[PDB]
Design a protein around this ligand. Sequence first.
Ligand SMILES: [Ca+2]
Length: 105
Amino acid sequence: LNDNDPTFRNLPFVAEILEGTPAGVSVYQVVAIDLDEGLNGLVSYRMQVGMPRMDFVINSTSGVVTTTAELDRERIAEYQLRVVASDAGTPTKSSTSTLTVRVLD
Ligand SMILES: [Ca+2]
């Protein structure tokens, strides 16, 4: 059955990114691994907050994180992006860790 929750290999992480970094920049690629077999160890990625106006998206397959707007320290200085890594197990197992982004002046 579904023994193992996915385990993050590269979260938590604090990224510093220069303000003026435009929309459409892939800033990171999250990796979580699941020891379980087949469907029980196929990992998918989402943000914890379903909020549709975030300045970052994560691709559910690749775990690639991309800007959706120009970063501006005067607008948001720090993002704590909670990433959920889930397996496709019949009971779904998941882990959450934070990609923190600090916008440098
Ligand atoms: Ca699993």
